[PDB]
Design an enzyme around this catalytic site. Structure first.
Site, PDB file in Angstrom:
ATOM      1  N   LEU D  38      53.454  33.544  33.108  1.00  0.00           N
ATOM      2  CA  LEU D  38      54.846  33.237  32.829  1.00  0.00           C
ATOM      3  C   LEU D  38      55.511  32.609  34.044  1.00  0.00           C
ATOM      4  CD1 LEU D  38      56.047  36.403  30.928  1.00  0.00           C
ATOM      5  CD2 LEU D  38      55.579  34.188  29.951  1.00  0.00           C
ATOM      6  N   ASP D  39      56.436  31.695  33.770  1.00  0.00           N
ATOM      7  CA  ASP D  39      57.343  31.168  34.775  1.00  0.00           C
ATOM      8  C   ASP D  39      58.306  32.274  35.204  1.00  0.00           C
ATOM      9  OD1 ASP D  39      58.142  28.384  35.976  1.00  0.00           O
ATOM     10  OD2 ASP D  39      60.063  29.233  35.338  1.00  0.00           O
ATOM     11  N   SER D  40      58.986  32.065  36.333  1.00  0.00           N
ATOM     12  CA  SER D  40      59.980  33.045  36.761  1.00  0.00           C
ATOM     13  C   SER D  40      61.167  33.078  35.813  1.00  0.00           C
ATOM     14  CB  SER D  40      60.461  32.745  38.170  1.00  0.00           C
ATOM     15  OG  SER D  40      59.401  32.775  39.092  1.00  0.00           O
ATOM     16  N   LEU D  41      61.552  31.919  35.273  1.00  0.00           N
ATOM     17  CA  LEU D  41      62.674  31.860  34.342  1.00  0.00           C
ATOM     18  C   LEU D  41      62.340  32.543  33.022  1.00  0.00           C
ATOM     19  CD1 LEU D  41      63.802  28.194  35.030  1.00  0.00           C
ATOM     20  CD2 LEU D  41      64.771  30.287  35.938  1.00  0.00           C
ATOM     21  N   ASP D  42      61.053  32.584  32.665  1.00  0.00           N
ATOM     22  CA  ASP D  42      60.607  33.425  31.561  1.00  0.00           C
ATOM     23  C   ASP D  42      60.893  34.893  31.838  1.00  0.00           C
ATOM     24  OD1 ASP D  42      59.659  31.358  29.941  1.00  0.00           O
ATOM     25  OD2 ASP D  42      57.729  31.313  30.981  1.00  0.00           O
TER      26      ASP D  42
END
Ligand code: CDL
Ligand code: ZMP
Ligand code: SF4
Ligand code: SF4
Lengths: 96, 176, 113, 82, 208, 114
Positions: D38-42
């Site tokens: 996952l991305d951090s914004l996820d």
């Protein structure tokens, strides 16, 4: 101008001012639309002698700004100019 | 050298107090304003009968553009591009080549009248009185591209309006 | 004489301008004593404050005090004394008599480029 | 807030409403960044979904340290009685 | 040189030079240059950490009283590494004079906002943000003031083109004014007008 | 190389501000789709927010991302308060623009741009 004297008197009474001495519509008192040809004067540099341009060169007497202080006694405190003189009230119509 | 608008203290004697109370209760300044409006009711109005009457203009007026000619039919423009060099809107576009008798003349002379700011710098920059700005102001169009003048439109405006343009230049060239 | 208005909007008429100017000038000098003596701000402001305080003490009239303090109405002279006091209290915190914090880059004030 | 197992099941319900996480790999100790991918914004919108479910504002310093569902349910327990 | 040359005001030149010495020695922590032009205007060139002390001094000092902020301006000069030149034009009503206060920043260093000194500055430095991108720290409401709401870039920078990057038109498909990349039917014709001959020998920069 | 900061002393505080700005946009997107009555979905606008945040994902200077957070807060303030109209919000979605040629060969076919 073509107003009858009854309407002219009524109009002067309701305004309170004499309106025929100062009409806002223009008539034969204005300048003629056909004028004589002018003969315009020349400037003071229209001379045939003693008229060298380097002795009247405005743009070349502009100098760079004199650097007063740069980072490369009991002297009197100064102001940028003398203080502004207090205005006198109007002698013509002070509303006083 | 200065005056005080609105620095009047009103008189407080019974005469002036009754004057101001009569002004309040009997609406005297309101009848003054009604009288001034009634005074303009009985004036001749300042309305001119357009289009049958026209507003006054001077010979300096800056209206529709036109390319002029000498009194031989030879067009005055010698393609020097001072008018598009000075044109503050860049409304003027000029191309040029020597024409078939070797003369320095334009092939393109465009003036976008919808860029044009009608300031007359082209007619004062022109050294041969070729481009002038005529007296025509009654030239509203119905489509935008009818105001994108090429050389043929400007030469037709010159041929159309020369009888008037030459007289206005005749009246105003000594001020120039 | 009780000046009726200053003419400036929002500038209230001061009833006793002399005592107010004396308090403001001595308070400016009291604050300004907390600045080093080699600071030019202290010397210049002590100079003009002592001149204004001598003029205030030497003239009982208010109109002639206005003509020789040479600073407009007397209430805006009071306001400028207040502004000078507030400035001196800020100049103690800024310490602007210190040397130059940073030289500029080499062609920073060179015009034309 | 009543039972801890209900809080953990509701955290897993929020995470299985989240579409990008595989429900097969979704476990209690499944890391968001290096396991789930996952991305951090996820993770930021996962924390916002947790705030939408449990009704309290999770600050920034203690939402960056929420990298698995067990850390989320431990934080929701530690900000409550349970 | 009488009729056509502007007459030089020597009195105001001497007075503004003396006042420039005064400001330079009261505030040597920030004042870098002081220069008086030939047409008698006084510029104070300062370090940007002293925006609030220099302007508060000029506003509140008894020998300054520059109570009026006339104008506040950035100038973009791209060859300087601190390319933005923040210009303060002050007006003294007590002493009937004007002073120019100048300082610098690049795209990333913020300038301290001067609304605590002049409430006139509130929209001016907001315009400097809108047009140049100079961020003013501790500003009440810093945002755009003149460009459109979705506008990208700062238009008065000199690397920004004259016509911008996007242009608008109405589009009947989406029932909406839309932004599309800019295309001119006639390009702005750039004129190289500069003369190859030196005009002003007094302004000649020395060679390398 | 000693520079005056804007808000963040280093990149961790800067990423904190990026993260809070993203939270604010993510909360705002349903309200923006509602009151501007956009023809997009909430997921589509949130994908556009994620696209705009991933566009600037290469920046390693704290002052630059401080300014990016400042301009993002200004965009957010123009969107929460109805200062933008529907057109300004839909200018993020380049809908009337034709799809640009991507590979070498189609760019060769249409023109001279690299
Ligand atoms: C009041 C009731 C109406 C009486 C007529 C009237 O007031 O005439 C205006 C007449 C002229 O007024 P004026 O403002 O001095 O006009 C100057 C014009 O330049 C002088 O007039 P002019 O030079 O323009 O002359 C041409 C003008 C001459 O003007 C007239 O004939 C006036 C209109 C007469 C009807 O005629 C027209 O323009 C044709 C107008 C035709 C229609 C008039 C309205 C008809 C209404 C009923 C149907 O007013 C007076 O003479 C004063 C008031 C008289 C009241 C009498 C007691 C009632
Ligand atoms: C309707 C549409 C609305 C459109 C809204 C547009 C608003 C755009 C706001 C943009 C604000 C920014 O670009 S700030 C982002 C710049 N940040 C950086 O350069 C630092 C790097 N940031 C990251 O890597 C970020 O992914 C995180 C979340 C901070 C950390 O992720 P990494 O770990 O993986
Ligand atoms: S009137 Fe002015 S704007 Fe119009 S074509 Fe002439 S120079 Fe250009
Ligand atoms: S300035 Fe006159 S002669 Fe020269 S190109 Fe223009 S219209 Fe022609």
């Amino acid at each position: 101008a073509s107003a009858t004297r009854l309407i002219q008197g009524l109009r002067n009474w309701a305004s309170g001012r004499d309106l025929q001495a100062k009409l806002q519509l223009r008539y034969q008192e204005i300048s003629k639309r056909t004028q004589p040809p002018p003969k315009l004067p020349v400037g003071p540099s229209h001379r045939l002698s003693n008229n060298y341009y380097c002795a009247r060169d405005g743009r070349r007497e502009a100098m760079p700004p004199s650097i007063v202080m740069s980072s490369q006694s009991e002297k009197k405190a100064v102001s940028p100019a003398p203080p502004i003189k207090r205005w006198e009230l109007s002698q013509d119509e002070p509303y006083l | 050298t200065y005056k005080y608008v609105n620095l009047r203290e009103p008189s407080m004697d019974m005469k002036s107090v009754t004057d101001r109370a009569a002004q309040t209760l009997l609406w005297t300044e309101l009848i003054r304003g009604l009288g001034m409006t009634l005074s303009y009711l009985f004036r001749e109005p300042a309305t001119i009968n357009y289009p049958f009457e026209k507003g006054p203009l001077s010979p300096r007026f800056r209206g529709e553009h036109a390319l002029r000619r000498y009194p031989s039919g030879e067009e005055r423009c010698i393609a020097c591009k001072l008018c598009e060099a000075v044109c503050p809107a860049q409304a003027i576009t000029i191309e040029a080549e020597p024409r078939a008798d070797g003369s320095r003349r334009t092939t393109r002379y465009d003036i976008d009248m919808t860029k044009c700011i009608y300031c007359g710098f082209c007619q004062e920059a022109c050294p041969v009185d070729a481009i002038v700005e005529g007296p025509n102001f009654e030239f509203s169009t119905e489509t935008h591209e009818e105001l994108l003048y090429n050389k043929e439109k400007l030469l037709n405006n010159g041929d159309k309006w020369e009888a008037e343009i030459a007289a206005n230049i005749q009246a105003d060239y000594l001020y120039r | 004489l009780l000046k009726k208005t200053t003419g400036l909007v929002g500038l209230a008429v001061c009833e006793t301008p002399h005592e107010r100017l004396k308090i403001l000038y001595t308070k400016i000098l009291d604050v300004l004593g907390h600045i080093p003596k080699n600071a030019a701000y202290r010397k210049y402001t002590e100079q003009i404050t002592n001149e204004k305080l001598s003029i205030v003490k030497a003239e009982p009239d208010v109109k002639k005090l206005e003509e020789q303090l040479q600073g407009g109405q007397i209430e805006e002279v009071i306001l400028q004394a207040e502004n000078e006091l507030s400035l001196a209290r800020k100049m103690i915190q800024w310490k602007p008599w210190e040397p130059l914090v940073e030289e500029p880059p080499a062609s920073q004030w060179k015009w034309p480029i | 807030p009543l039972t801890l197992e209900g809080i953990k099941d509701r955290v897993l319900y929020v995470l299985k409403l989240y579409d990008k996480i595989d429900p097969e790999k979704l476990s209690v100790n499944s890391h968001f960044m290096k396991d789930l991918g996952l991305d951090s914004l996820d993770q930021v919108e996962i924390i916002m979904a947790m705030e939408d479910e449990f009704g309290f504002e999770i600050p920034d310093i203690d939402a960056e340290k929420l990298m698995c569902p067990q850390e989320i349910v431990d934080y929701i327990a530690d900000k409550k009685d349970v | 040189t009488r009729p056509t040359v502007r007459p030089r005001n020597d009195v105001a030149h001497k007075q503004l030079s003396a006042f420039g010495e005064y400001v330079a020695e009261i505030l040597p922590k920030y004042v870098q240059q002081v220069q008086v032009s030939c047409f008698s205007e006084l510029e104070i060139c300062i370090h940007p950490d002293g925006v609030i002390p220099v302007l508060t001094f000029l506003r509140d000092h008894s020998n300054a009283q520059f109570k009026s902020l006339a104008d506040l301006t950035a100038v973009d000069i791209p060859t300087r590494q601190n390319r933005f030149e923040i210009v303060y034009n002050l007006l003294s009503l007590r002493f009937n004079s004007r002073i120019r206060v100048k300082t610098y920043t690049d795209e990333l260093t913020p300038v301290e906002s001067s609304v605590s000194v002049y409430k006139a500055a509130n929209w001016y430095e907001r315009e400097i943000w809108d047009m140049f991108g100079v961020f003013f720290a501790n500003h009440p409401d810093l945002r755009r003031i003149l460009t459109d709401y979705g506008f990208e870039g700062h238009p008065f920078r000199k690397d920004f083109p004259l016509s911008g990057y996007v242009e608008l038109r109405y589009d009947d498909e989406v029932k909406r004014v839309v932004a599309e990349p800019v295309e001119l039917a006639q390009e702005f014709r750039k004129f190289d007008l500069n003369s190859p001959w030196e005009a002003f020998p007094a302004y000649r920069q020395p060679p390398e | 190389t000693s520079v005056k900061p804007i808000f963040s002393r280093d990149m961790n505080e800067a990423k904190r501000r990026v993260r809070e700005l993203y939270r604010a946009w993510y909360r705002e997107v349903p309200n923006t789709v509602h009151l501007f009555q956009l023809d997009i979905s909430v997921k589509q606008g949130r994908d556009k927010v994620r696209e705009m945040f991933k566009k600037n994902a290469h920046v390693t200077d704290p002052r630059v991302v401080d300014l990016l957070v400042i301009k993002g807060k200004m965009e957010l303030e123009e969107t929460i308060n109805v200062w933008k109209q529907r057109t300004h919000v839909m200018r993020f979605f380049h809908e009337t623009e034709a799809p640009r040629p991507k590979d070498f060969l189609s760019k060769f076919y249409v023109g001279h741009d690299p």
